[PDB]
Write an enzyme that holds these catalytic residues in place. Structure first.
Site, PDB file in Angstrom:
ATOM      1  N   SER A 150       0.883  -1.153   0.000  1.00 18.63           N
ATOM      2  CA  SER A 150       0.000   0.000   0.000  1.00 18.63           C
ATOM      3  C   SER A 150       0.927   1.211   0.000  1.00 18.63           C
ATOM      4  CB  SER A 150      -0.988  -0.080   1.199  1.00 18.63           C
ATOM      5  OG  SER A 150      -1.804   1.076   1.369  1.00 18.63           O
ATOM      6  N   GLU A 166      -8.178  -5.327  -5.694  1.00 14.85           N
ATOM      7  CA  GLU A 166      -7.659  -4.228  -4.913  1.00 14.85           C
ATOM      8  C   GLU A 166      -8.810  -3.307  -4.564  1.00 14.85           C
ATOM      9  OE1 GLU A 166      -4.492  -4.141  -3.723  1.00 14.85           O
ATOM     10  OE2 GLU A 166      -3.242  -5.139  -5.241  1.00 14.85           O
ATOM     11  N   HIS A 225      -7.427  -5.898  -0.988  1.00 10.93           N
ATOM     12  CA  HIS A 225      -6.291  -5.051  -0.643  1.00 10.93           C
ATOM     13  C   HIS A 225      -5.798  -5.308   0.793  1.00 10.93           C
ATOM     14  CE1 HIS A 225      -3.608  -1.612  -0.968  1.00 10.93           C
ATOM     15  NE2 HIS A 225      -4.167  -1.039   0.087  1.00 10.93           N
TER      16      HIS A 225
HETATM   17  C1  HTB Z   1      -8.354   2.068  -4.298  1.00 12.49           C
HETATM   18  C2  HTB Z   1      -8.280   3.451  -4.167  1.00 12.49           C
HETATM   19  C3  HTB Z   1      -7.252   3.974  -3.420  1.00 12.49           C
HETATM   20  C4  HTB Z   1      -6.371   3.134  -2.858  1.00 12.49           C
HETATM   21  O1  HTB Z   1      -5.280   3.415  -2.078  1.00 12.49           O
HETATM   22  C5  HTB Z   1      -4.739   2.211  -1.771  1.00 12.49           C
HETATM   23  C6  HTB Z   1      -3.481   2.060  -0.871  1.00 12.49           C
HETATM   24  N1  HTB Z   1      -3.687   2.323   0.589  1.00 12.49           N
HETATM   25  C7  HTB Z   1      -5.089   2.510   1.034  1.00 12.49           C
HETATM   26  C8  HTB Z   1      -5.262   2.161   2.533  1.00 12.49           C
HETATM   27  C9  HTB Z   1      -5.939   3.272   3.322  1.00 12.49           C
HETATM   28  C10 HTB Z   1      -7.338   2.779   3.741  1.00 12.49           C
HETATM   29  C11 HTB Z   1      -7.128   1.908   4.966  1.00 12.49           C
HETATM   30  C12 HTB Z   1      -8.212   2.110   5.998  1.00 12.49           C
HETATM   31  C13 HTB Z   1      -8.502   0.681   6.428  1.00 12.49           C
HETATM   32  N2  HTB Z   1      -7.310  -0.211   6.560  1.00 12.49           N
HETATM   33  C14 HTB Z   1      -7.102  -1.242   5.713  1.00 12.49           C
HETATM   34  C15 HTB Z   1      -5.837  -1.396   5.188  1.00 12.49           C
HETATM   35  C16 HTB Z   1      -5.632  -2.416   4.233  1.00 12.49           C
HETATM   36  N3  HTB Z   1      -6.653  -3.196   3.870  1.00 12.49           N
HETATM   37  C17 HTB Z   1      -7.874  -3.052   4.365  1.00 12.49           C
HETATM   38  C18 HTB Z   1      -8.873  -3.929   3.915  1.00 12.49           C
HETATM   39  C19 HTB Z   1     -10.180  -3.835   4.370  1.00 12.49           C
HETATM   40  C20 HTB Z   1     -10.457  -2.837   5.281  1.00 12.49           C
HETATM   41  C21 HTB Z   1      -9.472  -1.993   5.746  1.00 12.49           C
HETATM   42  C22 HTB Z   1      -8.147  -2.077   5.303  1.00 12.49           C
HETATM   43  C23 HTB Z   1      -4.384  -2.723   3.622  1.00 12.49           C
HETATM   44  C24 HTB Z   1      -3.528  -1.571   3.796  1.00 12.49           C
HETATM   45  C25 HTB Z   1      -3.477  -1.150   5.245  1.00 12.49           C
HETATM   46  C26 HTB Z   1      -4.793  -0.532   5.593  1.00 12.49           C
HETATM   47  C27 HTB Z   1      -5.432   1.224  -2.342  1.00 12.49           C
HETATM   48  C28 HTB Z   1      -6.440   1.793  -2.988  1.00 12.49           C
HETATM   49  C29 HTB Z   1      -7.414   1.246  -3.690  1.00 12.49           C
END
Ligand code: HTB
Ligand SMILES: *[C@@H]1O[C@H](CO)[C@@H](O[C@@H]2O[C@H](CO)[C@@H](O)[C@H](O)[C@H]2NC(C)=O)[C@H](O)[C@H]1NC(C)=O
Ligand code: NAG
Ligand code: NAG
EC number: 3.1.1.7
Length: 534
Positions: free
Chosen positions: A199, A326, A439
């Protein structure tokens, strides 16, 4: 030494802690500072290196997580809460964690983990960033760093030196300086350090590959679902300024000079900035990439694309990839029709809107272009197709196609690329089926969690995790994820001509070419061209 858990470092003496690891044990050093607490008048500035200390730093527990917005969209829900802080939050948060194998090794390979979270959240201390199974299973020294996120990390009034911006990237670089200078005492080869991350961690890795000030501090790089050219990963210095003044405006602040503005912002309590953070975004994208890295002329000498064309970056070996879905969590959190507990089938109308949400920067023609691209017109009222098409829109535009652009660019100049597509949906997944391979959900494979019996992963998932940890660690050790002349199937090198990559799942390995060409040609060439003309 007369001890295994005691280490003397150019900063100070550090006292470890012994930890169980699937019936074995290893050493672990938690919460070692690498910089001065960035509190009070130090907020939004470059970090300072930690002033060396008299005595034994008790490095037996995880440190305070940095200050971030917490995720309450599903209170109690593990799928979402695993990603939130699990130690107290504090501006005093620039620490790091080492897991050393036991017995301490000689000068073996080091991996440093850089967490994601969109540059506004994240934590080094999460269950799934537990370094012990990888450090153990593959005999590597595994470090995990921490860095200021949000405004604390990325408020950017370029021209100023009080809040120059990018400081959270500098936090990571300093953690990396410290590994360069001290990882020897812990058994690790400062000439064999792989930075890896997912990420915003994945993009941060790519930004260290790019930045002159960081290239010399590490050897190899793994990027997982993140890339420095992702549209959510940077902003112009103009737009950082504009966004920074808007945080003042939102908090009743003098706006006549930077000194005025920073001073005001330094007086406010943490949770106050966090609470008006959303309100800087033009409109909008869903969720809060308010404060992110700036293309500043310093950390980044010129624009990324220009750096990437001219070859102005570190030339080494990279390993990187993306997950199959993603986009799914973005839709869930920010788009209508999509909810955790339904199949989330999408009316044709909710598709028009979802498209608009996902491609904010576009005009009506852009939206038509994207709509045409992703719509089966022999069956335009299929709610599964519409739901899945929106998923792909969001995933391709924000993660896969910027990553594929980076890959094709890097590989013209670099020294060996390996490219993965992780499409396994885990048996014990707490999220609903329609989200698919989410993601973040390959991290757990990389960090070993399926080897823990308690957590109900299947055996074929245990084998996948073991295979992946090996690819990763073999790659960090050698610049190649394959074993010298082994029987197992070979993960081919990604080349400009042939662009091979592998899936990463439980079925026997399959190699493919041109990962999402068709759509990525759309997002990387056609659509930008069409928006620049109209
Ligand atoms: C579509 C549009 C914009 C995007 O930006 C990104 C890269 N980072 C985005 C992470 C920021 C949001 C995180 C808030 C919640 N934390 C999560 C995070 C992640 N996965 C999640 C999966 C389900 C629910 C929450 C998750 C993986 C990254 C750490 C935070 C991925 C992405 C995909
Ligand atoms: C990575 O770089 C190495 C060394 O910088 C390249 O290996 C050299 O290849 C040339 C022509 O293939 C040979 O004359 C040398 O014998 C090789 N040198 C060494 C030190 O092995 C290598 O080809 C690069 N790898 C990739 C995938 O681009
Ligand atoms: C290190 O700190 C924690 C904090 O409570 C404590 O549990 C642990 O026993 C301490 N060890 C030493 C050396 O004091
Ligand atoms: C499998 O383990 C989980 C731990 O996350 C536990 O809560 C659950 O009850 C177990 N499954 C069943 C069907 O009992």
């Amino acid at each position: 030494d007369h001890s295994e858990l005691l280490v003397n470092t150019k900063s100070g003496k550090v006292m470890g802690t012994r930890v169980p690891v699937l019936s074995s044990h290893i050493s672990a050093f938690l919460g070692i500072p690498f910089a001065e607490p960035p509190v009070g008048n130090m907020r939004f500035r470059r970090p300072e290196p930690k002033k060396p200390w008299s005595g034994v730093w008790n490095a037996s527990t995880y440190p305070n997580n940095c200050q971030q917005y917490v995720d309450e969209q599903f209170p109690g829900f593990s799928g979402s809460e695993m990603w939130n802080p699990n130690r107290e939050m504090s501006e005093d948060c620039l620490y790091l964690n080492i897991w050393v194998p036991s017995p301490r090794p000689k000068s073996t390979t080091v991996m440093v983990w850089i967490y994601g979270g969109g540059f506004y959240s994240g934590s080094s201390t999460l269950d799934v960033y537990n370094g012990k199974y990888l450090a153990y299973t593959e005999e590597v020294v595994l470090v995990s760093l921490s860095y200021r996120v949000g405004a604390f990390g990325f408020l950017a009034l370029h021209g100023s030196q009080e809040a120059p911006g990018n400081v959270g990237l500098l936090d990571q670089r300093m953690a990396l300086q410290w590994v360069h200078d001290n990882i020897q005492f812990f058994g690790g080869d400062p000439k064999t350090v792989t930075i890896f991350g997912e990420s915003a961690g994945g993009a941060s890795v790519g930004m260290h590959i790019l930045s002159p000030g960081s290239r010399d501090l590490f050897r190899r790089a793994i990027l997982q679902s993140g890339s420095p050219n992702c549209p959510w990963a940077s902003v112009s210095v103009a737009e950082g300024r504009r966004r920074a003044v808007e945080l003042g405006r939102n908090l009743n602040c003098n706006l006549n000079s930077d000194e005025e503005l920073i001073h005001c912002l330094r007086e406010k309590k943490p949770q106050e900035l966090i609470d008006v953070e959303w309100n800087v975004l033009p409109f909008d994208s869903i969720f809060r990439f308010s404060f992110v890295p700036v293309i500043d002329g310093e950390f980044f000498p010129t624009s990324l694309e220009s750096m990437l064309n001219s070859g102005n970056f570190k030339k080494t070996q990279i390993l990187l990839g993306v997950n199959k879905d993603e986009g799914s969590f973005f839709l869930l959190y920010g788009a209508p029709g999509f909810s955790k507990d339904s199949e989330s089938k999408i009316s044709r109308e909710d598709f028009m809107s979802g498209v608009k949400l996902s491609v904010p920067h576009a005009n009506d023609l852009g939206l038509d272009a994207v709509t045409l691209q992703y719509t089966d017109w022999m069956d335009d009222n299929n709610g599964i197709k519409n739901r899945d098409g929106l998923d792909d829109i969001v995933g391709d535009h924000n993660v896969i196609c910027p990553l594929m652009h980076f890959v094709n660019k890097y590989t013209k100049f670099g020294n060996g690329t390996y490219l993965y597509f992780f499409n396994h949906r885990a048996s014990n997944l707490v999220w609903p089926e329609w989200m698919g391979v989410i993601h973040g959900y390959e991290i757990e494979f990389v960090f070993g969690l399926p080897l823990v019996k308690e957590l109900n992963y299947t055996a074929e998932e245990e084998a996948l995790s073991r295979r992946i940890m090996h690819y990763w660690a073999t790659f960090a050790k050698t610049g190649n994820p394959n074993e010298p002349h082994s029987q197992e199937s070979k993960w081919p090198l990604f080349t400009t001509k042939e662009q091979k990559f592998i899936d990463l799942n439980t079925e026997p390995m399959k190699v493919h070419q041109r990962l999402r060409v068709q759509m990525c040609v759309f997002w990387n060439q056609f659509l930008p061209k069409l928006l620049n003309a109209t």
